[PDB]
Amino acid sequence: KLFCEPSGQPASTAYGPALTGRPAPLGASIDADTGAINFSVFSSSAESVSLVLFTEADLNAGRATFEIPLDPYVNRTGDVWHIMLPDLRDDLLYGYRVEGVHQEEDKDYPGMRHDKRRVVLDPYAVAVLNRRRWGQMGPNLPYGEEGVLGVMPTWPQAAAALPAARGSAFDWEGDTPLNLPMESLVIYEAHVRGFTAHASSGVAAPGTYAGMVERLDYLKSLGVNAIELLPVFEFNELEYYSQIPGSDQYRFNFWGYSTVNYFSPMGRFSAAVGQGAPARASCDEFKQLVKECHRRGIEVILDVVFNHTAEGNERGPTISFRGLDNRVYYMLAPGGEYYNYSGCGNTLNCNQPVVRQFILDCLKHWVTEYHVDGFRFDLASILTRAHSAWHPQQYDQETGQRVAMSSGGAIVTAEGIMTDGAGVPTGYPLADPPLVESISEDPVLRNTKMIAEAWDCDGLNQVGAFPHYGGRWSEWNGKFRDVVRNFIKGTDGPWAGDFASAICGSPNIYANNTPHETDWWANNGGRQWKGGRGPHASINFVAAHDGFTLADMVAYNNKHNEANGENNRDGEQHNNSWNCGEEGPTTKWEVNRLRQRQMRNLTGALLLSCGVPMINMGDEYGHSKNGNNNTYCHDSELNYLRWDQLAEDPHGFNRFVRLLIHFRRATPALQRTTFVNDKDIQWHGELPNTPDWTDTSRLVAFTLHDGKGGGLYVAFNTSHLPKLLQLPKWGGRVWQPLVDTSKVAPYDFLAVDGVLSAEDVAAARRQMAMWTADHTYPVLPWSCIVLQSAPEDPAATSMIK
Amino acid sequence: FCEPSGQPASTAYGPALTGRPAPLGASIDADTGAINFSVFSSSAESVSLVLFTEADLNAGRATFEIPLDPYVNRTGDVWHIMLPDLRDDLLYGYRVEGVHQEEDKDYPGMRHDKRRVVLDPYAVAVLNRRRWGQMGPNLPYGEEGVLGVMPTWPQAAAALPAASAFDWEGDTPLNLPMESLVIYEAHVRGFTAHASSGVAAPGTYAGMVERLDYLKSLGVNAIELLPVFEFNELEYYSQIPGSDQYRFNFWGYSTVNYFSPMGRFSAAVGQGAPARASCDEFKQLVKECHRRGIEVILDVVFNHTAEGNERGPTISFRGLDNRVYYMLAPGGEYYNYSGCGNTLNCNQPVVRQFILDCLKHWVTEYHVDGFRFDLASILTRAHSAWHPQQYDQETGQRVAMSSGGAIVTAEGIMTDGAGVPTGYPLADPPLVESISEDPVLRNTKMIAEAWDCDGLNQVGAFPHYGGRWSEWNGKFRDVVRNFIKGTDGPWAGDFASAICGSPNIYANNTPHETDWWANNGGRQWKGGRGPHASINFVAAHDGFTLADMVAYNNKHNEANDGEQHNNSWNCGEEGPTTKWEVNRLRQRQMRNLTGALLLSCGVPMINMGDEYGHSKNGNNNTYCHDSELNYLRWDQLAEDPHGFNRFVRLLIHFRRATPALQRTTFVNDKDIQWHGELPNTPDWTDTSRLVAFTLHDGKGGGLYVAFNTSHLPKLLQLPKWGGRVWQPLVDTSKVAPYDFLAVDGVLSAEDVAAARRQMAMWTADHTYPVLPWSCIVLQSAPEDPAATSMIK
Numbered sequence A: 001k002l003f004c005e006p007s008g009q010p011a012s013t014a015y016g017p018a019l020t021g022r023p024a025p026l027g028a029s030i031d032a033d034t035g036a037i038n039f040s041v042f043s044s045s046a047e048s049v050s051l052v053l054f055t056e057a058d059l060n061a062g063r064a065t066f067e068i069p070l071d072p073y074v075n076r077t078g079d080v081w082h083i084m085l086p087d088l089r090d091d092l093l094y095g096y097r098v099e100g101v102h103q104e105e106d107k108d109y110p111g112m113r114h115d116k117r118r119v120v121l122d123p124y125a126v127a128v129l130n131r132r133r134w135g136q137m138g139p140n141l142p143y144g145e146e147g148v149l150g151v152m153p154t155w156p157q158a159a160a161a162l163p164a165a166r167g168s169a170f171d172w173e174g175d176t177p178l179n180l181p182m183e184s185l186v187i188y189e190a191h192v193r194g195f196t197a198h199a200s201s202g203v204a205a206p207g208t209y210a211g212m213v214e215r216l217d218y219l220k221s222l223g224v225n226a227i228e229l230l231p232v233f234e235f236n237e238l239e240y241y242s243q244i245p246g247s248d249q250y251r252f253n254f255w256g257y258s259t260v261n262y263f264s265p266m267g268r269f270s271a272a273v274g275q276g277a278p279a280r281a282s283c284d285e286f287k288q289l290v291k292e293c294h295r296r297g298i299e300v301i302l303d304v305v306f307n308h309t310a311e312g313n314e315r316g317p318t319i320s321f322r323g324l325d326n327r328v329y330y331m332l333a334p335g336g337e338y339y340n341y342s343g344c345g346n347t348l349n350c351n352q353p354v355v356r357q358f359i360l361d362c363l364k365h366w367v368t369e370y371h372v373d374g375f376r377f378d379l380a381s382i383l384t385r386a387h388s389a390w391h392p393q394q395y396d397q398e399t400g401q402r403v404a405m406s407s408g409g410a411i412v413t414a415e416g417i418m419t420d421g422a423g424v425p426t427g428y429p430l431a432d433p434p435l436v437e438s439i440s441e442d443p444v445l446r447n448t449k450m451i452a453e454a455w456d457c458d459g460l461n462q463v464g465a466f467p468h469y470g471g472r473w474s475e476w477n478g479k480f481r482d483v484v485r486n487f488i489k490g491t492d493g494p495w496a497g498d499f500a501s502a503i504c505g506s507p508n509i510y511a512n513n514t515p516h517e518t519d520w521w522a523n524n525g526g527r528q529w530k531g532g533r534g535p536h537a538s539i540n541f542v543a544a545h546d547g548f549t550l551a552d553m554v555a556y557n558n559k560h561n562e563a564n565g566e567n568n569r570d571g572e573q574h575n576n577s578w579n580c581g582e583e584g585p586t587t588k589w590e591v592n593r594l595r596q597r598q599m600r601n602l603t604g605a606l607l608l609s610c611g612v613p614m615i616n617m618g619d620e621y622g623h624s625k626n627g628n629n630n631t632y633c634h635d636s637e638l639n640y641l642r643w644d645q646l647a648e649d650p651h652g653f654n655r656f657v658r659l660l661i662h663f664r665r666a667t668p669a670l671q672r673t674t675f676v677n678d679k680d681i682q683w684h685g686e687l688p689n690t691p692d693w694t695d696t697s698r699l700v701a702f703t704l705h706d707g708k709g710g711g712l713y714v715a716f717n718t719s720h721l722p723k724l725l726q727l728p729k730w731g732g733r734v735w736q737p738l739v740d741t742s743k744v745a746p747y748d749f750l751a752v753d754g755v756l757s758a759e760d761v762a763a764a765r766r767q768m769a770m771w772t773a774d775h776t777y778p779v780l781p782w783s784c785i786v787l788q789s790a791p792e793d794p795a796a797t798s799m800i801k
Numbered sequence B: 001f002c003e004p005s006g007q008p009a010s011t012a013y014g015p016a017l018t019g020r021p022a023p024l025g026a027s028i029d030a031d032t033g034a035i036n037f038s039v040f041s042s043s044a045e046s047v048s049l050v051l052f053t054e055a056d057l058n059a060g061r062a063t064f065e066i067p068l069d070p071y072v073n074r075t076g077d078v079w080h081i082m083l084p085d086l087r088d089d090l091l092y093g094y095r096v097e098g099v100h101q102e103e104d105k106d107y108p109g110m111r112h113d114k115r116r117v118v119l120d121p122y123a124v125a126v127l128n129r130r131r132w133g134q135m136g137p138n139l140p141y142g143e144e145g146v147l148g149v150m151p152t153w154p155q156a157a158a159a160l161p162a163a164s165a166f167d168w169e170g171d172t173p174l175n176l177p178m179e180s181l182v183i184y185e186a187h188v189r190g191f192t193a194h195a196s197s198g199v200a201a202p203g204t205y206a207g208m209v210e211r212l213d214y215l216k217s218l219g220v221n222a223i224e225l226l227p228v229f230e231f232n233e234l235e236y237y238s239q240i241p242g243s244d245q246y247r248f249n250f251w252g253y254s255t256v257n258y259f260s261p262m263g264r265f266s267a268a269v270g271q272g273a274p275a276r277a278s279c280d281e282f283k284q285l286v287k288e289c290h291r292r293g294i295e296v297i298l299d300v301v302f303n304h305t306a307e308g309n310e311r312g313p314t315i316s317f318r319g320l321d322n323r324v325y326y327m328l329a330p331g332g333e334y335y336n337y338s339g340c341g342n343t344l345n346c347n348q349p350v351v352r353q354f355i356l357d358c359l360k361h362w363v364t365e366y367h368v369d370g371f372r373f374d375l376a377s378i379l380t381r382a383h384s385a386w387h388p389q390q391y392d393q394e395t396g397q398r399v400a401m402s403s404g405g406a407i408v409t410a411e412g413i414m415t416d417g418a419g420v421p422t423g424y425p426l427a428d429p430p431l432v433e434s435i436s437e438d439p440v441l442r443n444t445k446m447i448a449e450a451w452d453c454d455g456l457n458q459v460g461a462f463p464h465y466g467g468r469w470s471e472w473n474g475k476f477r478d479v480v481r482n483f484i485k486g487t488d489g490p491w492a493g494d495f496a497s498a499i500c501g502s503p504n505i506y507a508n509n510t511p512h513e514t515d516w517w518a519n520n521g522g523r524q525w526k527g528g529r530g531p532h533a534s535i536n537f538v539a540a541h542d543g544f545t546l547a548d549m550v551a552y553n554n555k556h557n558e559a560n561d562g563e564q565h566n567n568s569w570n571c572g573e574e575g576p577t578t579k580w581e582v583n584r585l586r587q588r589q590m591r592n593l594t595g596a597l598l599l600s601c602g603v604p605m606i607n608m609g610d611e612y613g614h615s616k617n618g619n620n621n622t623y624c625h626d627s628e629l630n631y632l633r634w635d636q637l638a639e640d641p642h643g644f645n646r647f648v649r650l651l652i653h654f655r656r657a658t659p660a661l662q663r664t665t666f667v668n669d670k671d672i673q674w675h676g677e678l679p680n681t682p683d684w685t686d687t688s689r690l691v692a693f694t695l696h697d698g699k700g701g702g703l704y705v706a707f708n709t710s711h712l713p714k715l716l717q718l719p720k721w722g723g724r725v726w727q728p729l730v731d732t733s734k735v736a737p738y739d740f741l742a743v744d745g746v747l748s749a750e751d752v753a754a755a756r757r758q759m760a761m762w763t764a765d766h767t768y769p770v771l772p773w774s775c776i777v778l779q780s781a782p783e784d785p786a787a788t789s790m791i792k
């Protein structure tokens, strides 16, 4: 009955005799009055659970240091196994050896995959230790043979770190989440390793959290106020380890979309872990990073991958969920086959109530413990899909043994199709997925920003209609990307009209609510989610870590992923790109000229649109992956911030981008929570108020008011020919040049900085005064301008100085 | 030895000697040191030499009078006397007695009056009134013994030769190749009269010297002076109803004496110095021009004199030999091809020789470099001849002759003695021939204003004697003015020709169907000349200012005549305005006209003031105004409110630095090519508003030039020259100083490089945007792909 009562297992050279303990909280926690360590882990299906303890030396030799088997009657309440250890030695790490049935051993129990030869990881582990250093192979052991822990050299035994002692807690120094209004954000999408891994970073600890801190100043000076980190939860970079043919380079799991543990920071991004620090060092190093971001005005948004795990399918390794309770954690068919909506091996059983709670807890854990500001949910559609349910295992009354069940205990239709227990066939996209409801409504998370990549690998696309619970979710707007890429490169079809919509924050998606005639989601489950949102629901992007780099969108018609080892079958097939006249690096002046313009024209579309822009690390200076549009597996300069190329800025593109960011941020009209109307914005062409929406259009142009008598004139000429634009006349006022991608840098962006003085800017405005007074502006093919309304001053046409 | 001629000595000289007829004028006998006086009159009966102290001259009174013996003191029609040991501070004239036609109708054309004392045509210096605008004395003119005509025309006298020659310090005329000239038409008083000039002696030869560095810095290498031969600025002295101000003869197109420099442009004469002081003041001016590589070209007026018609004053020729010196009908009426009252008898032999002697004088004595011939057509016309006077061998008295001795046809029409009707324009005028062939003048430039007031126009075919003559090209003016304002018609085509040095006017051997001169007297002159035959101008002292032809549709001459068809456009409003679009457009058009002028083959001339936007407030004939209308506004030049003076200055230097525009032969199709919005696709239609051309430098480089005269802007596809890109230099659509991208005190070489780079994407695309009513000049340069990287 009582938690303090000893449970029978004897003391050791490193702990007191075990006590009963408690179900809550899940994970390992410090008991407050005794100082002891309570362990709690869920499994509905395990027959036995042992807590396994390791020193690092023993961990590395594939052996346990101590084992404590839990009594199934004492050390268990419902489905939560638990035990407590006083005087536990700090140099020890922990896991669980879970015994039960496996389907390959007995057909009658499909979905069960217990294996006592493995020691599995606590899902709620605060920190994980296995391999200390990025890219370091696991130790050479006789894996597979009796008594040795670990799957293979690329998957050695891992273990969880004990909770920190009372009195030892992080000095936040009064740090808090920043809660910046969403519409005010400029998101930079970044990878922790790649941010400083290149020799040119010059940081003390390349490719780490601490390293990232040394170069955070550059981001603040760039004008960014949010950073979105690619997956930061423990993953195994050696999981795709193999040789690249034609090379001695080896491929890795670099990006990290394959999560081993969701509660622990990636240890092989921690400088301290590389230097031999205890496993929790990653925790405090990550905290430090978040503190440093916040000091600099930068929010932290974590890319989280709750739709599949590193365990893959049946052929993958057993490291956590599979060996604890495979039927609970993964989405399974009645035979035990893994659903593969992720396209990565398995699908997490998101709406199953234990799993739901896991995810809730996880998000609260990162917000509360690490002061994070938001999450970006990889393939978020899978979080809408209905789970697989199994009946609770029924045991024999007299015998105590295990009783087999109709359909293995899978809850099915009369036709055998799998079900969520509540009458919904497994996989069905729910209009009201209870996981998403809980995320949207949990008080701990109420000021936390949520962003959905609203699609998955089974062709489900929910953009415009992700279950958003009152405007509580924004979305990666891939239609924006497609529209901007198409319109800017110069293309027939609806792209001018669509581009104008993109510029306005895509009201055609988020405000409008009449669905496509053949779109099943929008006509059914998504129906109620279709309006009731603003332009800030749209995360706008032209490029991401996925797909072509900005520079490569203008240098490559086609992808070149041969080095990825899926023989070019991977990555986006339709990039809507144009090489500007020749594939890859060229010597032709005409083509390079054009690319310099196109890069800026695309950036202009991005930073001059309503909604919320996101920039892919590197795109702000011309970064190239040599035409590889899916560099998930390369630990090389293809995925690193080129501090050397940034400094060089050979055509002044970084200056242009920086300055446009700052300008965007100084322009309230661009940062809205409600959609612009005809008083806010007007559309033009070669003549004022005469836009071209035809299929052959190559021009979109508009005025944007500032509600103080001023505003901007913006134009995108996507023709192969130059044009003379007649500008709308605002009485008493004249348009003044600011942006012009026709001009060689620095005259492509007329604002004061280290390169152009106030005098230089005024001189450059006066030069054109005859043109602007005339309300006439010449534009180059494939070019972009931004002008500002100023009070007319007839003295502008007299001699300058 | 010259025999004594019998006249007594006096306090001022010794017993007179006979003297010689040569040289004409007053001169020093090399043998005795005596002053020899010589003077032509075939018609006179008596001639007395009259001498004046300055005091006596001022009081209308002669100090001495020496009657000449008609036998001993005369050889042929030349009267002469020598006076030894003459007080050199006296001045001289002649009292000439003879018949007058009003006192006797039998002698039409004779206008002797012995109450007058007339000036030596060959006078080296004249004294009459010492200061500009100074009224003559208030004498009882017309009464017995009082000399002078009225207060505006008091008695003049001529100075004697000096017995201390000027120090030229090796000065010679510069003999610059004609094709290298940029000419500045200027007026000696107007140049420094304005308070802002800040000179010691405003409005004088000495004052002009003090500001010549301005002209050198401007890049001008020839100055053409409005008439510096003595004239009477009080000829038109009269009050202007509007104002306090009086009307003058300001410009000076009404000469009193052709051999004397205008005394009232001399600071020294105005200060009481002897009359000769102006000779040295003028020599100093020429010397100082030459030190600065500036040539001196004199505007000369040999087609008429200040004596007007029969209602004007007898001061010189009329009283000496009216019949010789003036073009007369058989009743003694004054032909008036000049539109001024008289016509000088240019091709009669004594007259011819006078003009020639005059030109030689100014070249030899004053080191002048060239002449501009006012209404030069008049010098091509046949003169009027009269039989030599007949006297009774018995009585000695005059004999009347048939027709008054006029040499007429059977129908009574006047003739030149050799069968040509008086006034007929000659293919081979001996005066123009002599000018063209005389060795003294062989390296002297000659410029004809080849028309006159009876509608004779000879441009394209002035008798030029192997290209010895250039001409004011009035076609250029009209064409450039019409093309640049935007005007339907043949203007684009004519403008292209104007740019080529007007070969349609000077090398075109095919004359018009109707033009008499070209089909007859001028036929032999219709070719054999290069573009340097054409003196190009957009404006001159006559007509509208550059500024004003862009600000006024119609003239405004109330305060006074003046051109009626000006081909101007005010750019949207008459005169001054606050409308911004008008002022902007005027600023461009000033540059656009000046560009047409300075980017054309031939020889450009700039009218004083037009390099800073000088205005005459819409008055297009300011001949009678001694005021800031005709003064160089040093204050306004200093202000340069929209950088127009800078623009002009640079354009002039750039032109001098461009051999391709300074030619003695005409451009062919290898030299120049004609483009439009597309390369090699010009528009010659009646609605054309664009002319553009490439001009080779002979080294693989060259210029792209274009004038958009449309009201709409254009995009221009430039012609692609392999391995090369066009760089911006001139763009009249850019606000100064970016209208002219050249290094000076305002733009660094850094500034220029950066201005060029800005546009590297436009030029590499071979695409150039131009504003309406604008003009650009680009410069072919080797292609540098790195131009489009960061300027840095």
Ligand SMILES: *[C@@H]1O[C@H](CO)[C@@H](O[C@H]2O[C@H](CO)[C@@H](O[C@H]3O[C@H](CO)[C@@H](O[C@H]4O[C@H](CO)[C@@H](O[C@H]5O[C@H](CO)[C@@H](O[C@H]6O[C@H](CO)[C@@H](O[C@H]7O[C@H](CO)[C@@H](O)[C@H](O)[C@H]7O)[C@H](O)[C@H]6O)[C@H](O)[C@H]5O)[C@H](O)[C@H]4O)[C@H](O)[C@H]3O)[C@H](O)[C@H]2O)[C@H](O)[C@H]1O
Pocket (backbone or CB within 6 Å): A154, A155, A238, A239, A240, A241, A242, A253, A255, A256, A257, A258, A305, A310, A311, A312, A313, A314, A315, A316, A317, A340, A342, A343, A344, A345, A346, A378, A379, A453, A546, A566, A570, A571, A630, A632
């Ligand atoms: C938003 O969303 C997406 C997705 O989240 C992001 O997309 C990017 O990231 C993706 C994931 O990184 C990436 O996809 C690529 O990887 C996945 C796998 O994660 C691939 O998925 C398919 O193919 C794999 C591999 O064929 C299948 O895996 C199954 O089979 C293998 C067995 O072949 C199992 O591997 C396991 O066992 C092997 C063998 O024992 C282990 O390898 C070991 O031995 C080898 C030699 O024999 C050695 O080479 C190796 O070093 C040893 O370790 C291995 O470690 C172990 O995992 C799997 O477990 C099993 O599931 C999948 O079933 C199948 O779906 C894709 O094809 C790849 O493209 C995307 O391209 C990225 O774009 C996106 O970025 C986000 O925005």
Ligand SMILES: *[C@@H]1O[C@H](CO)[C@@H](O[C@H]2O[C@H](CO)[C@@H](O[C@H]3O[C@H](CO)[C@@H](O[C@H]4O[C@H](CO)[C@@H](O[C@H]5O[C@H](CO)[C@@H](O[C@H]6O[C@H](CO)[C@@H](O[C@H]7O[C@H](CO)[C@@H](O)[C@H](O)[C@H]7O)[C@H](O)[C@H]6O)[C@H](O)[C@H]5O)[C@H](O)[C@H]4O)[C@H](O)[C@H]3O)[C@H](O)[C@H]2O)[C@H](O)[C@H]1O
Pocket (backbone or CB within 6 Å): B152, B153, B234, B235, B236, B237, B238, B249, B251, B252, B253, B254, B301, B306, B307, B308, B309, B310, B311, B312, B313, B338, B339, B340, B341, B342, B374, B375, B449, B542, B561, B562, B621, B623
């Ligand atoms: C090249 O080509 C041309 C021409 O060379 C240049 O053109 C410019 O210069 C022109 C010449 O300066 C200028 O023309 C203007 O002036 C001329 C004359 O020089 C005019 O010619 C016509 O009209 C006049 C005036 O009616 C005629 O004059 C004749 O009659 C008058 C009147 O009697 C005579 O005047 C003489 O008599 C009176 C007697 O009392 C004297 O006046 C005095 O009393 C006045 C009051 O009662 C006082 O006010 C006055 O101050 C007193 O002195 C007068 O002084 C005296 O001379 C004339 O002698 C007699 O011939 C002409 O015959 C007739 O042809 C033009 O009409 C004028 O426009 C042009 O406008 C310029 O553009 C050009 O610049 C070059 O490219």
Ligand SMILES: OC[C@H]1O[C@H](O[C@H]2[C@H](O)[C@@H](O)[C@@H](O[C@H]3[C@H](O)[C@@H](O)[C@@H](O)O[C@@H]3CO)O[C@@H]2CO)[C@H](O)[C@@H](O)[C@@H]1O
Pocket (backbone or CB within 6 Å): A489, A490, A491, A576, A577, A578, A720
């Ligand atoms: O140069 C003359 C030509 O220019 C214009 O066509 C260009 C397009 O604007 C430009 O986007 C690109 O088109 C490519 C598509 O974007 C790409 O998806 C793929 O299909 O290849 C196309 C080119 O190979 O390039 C073309 C021209 O190269 C203009 O639209 C034409 O009308 C014009 O004749």
Ligand SMILES: OC[C@H]1O[C@H](O[C@H]2[C@H](O)[C@@H](O)[C@@H](O[C@H]3[C@H](O)[C@@H](O)[C@@H](O)O[C@@H]3CO)O[C@@H]2CO)[C@H](O)[C@@H](O)[C@@H]1O
Pocket (backbone or CB within 6 Å): A496, A497, A498, A499, A500, A501, A502, A504, A507, A508, A675, A676, A677, A678, A681, A682, A683, A693
């Ligand atoms: O005026 C404010 C208005 O701006 C935006 O509307 C523009 C659209 O984005 C744009 O596509 C275009 O719409 C036209 C279609 O493209 C065309 O095919 C045809 O059907 O006509 C449509 C209407 O013109 O132009 C509109 C502006 O007229 C924004 O989307 C609006 O919500 C906003 O109110």
Ligand SMILES: OC[C@H]1O[C@H](O[C@H]2[C@H](O)[C@@H](O)[C@@H](O[C@H]3[C@H](O)[C@@H](O)[C@@H](O)O[C@@H]3CO)O[C@@H]2CO)[C@H](O)[C@@H](O)[C@@H]1O
Pocket (backbone or CB within 6 Å): B492, B493, B494, B496, B497, B498, B500, B503, B504, B666, B667, B668, B669, B672, B673, B674, B684
């Ligand atoms: O290219 C060398 C050539 O240039 C100049 O000739 C141009 C003329 O100046 C210009 O008027 C124009 O002539 C055209 C007429 O206006 C038109 O009405 C019709 O008759 O055709 C004419 C041309 O075909 O163009 C010519 C250039 O062709 C200049 O006159 C010469 O010095 C030189 O030979």
Ligand SMILES: OC[C@H]1O[C@H](O)[C@H](O)[C@@H](O)[C@@H]1O
Pocket (backbone or CB within 6 Å): A455, A456, A457, A458, A459, A460, A461, A478
């Ligand atoms: O399912 C995968 C795909 O879904 C969506 O249709 C997106 O447009 C695409 O970018 C994404 O990768």
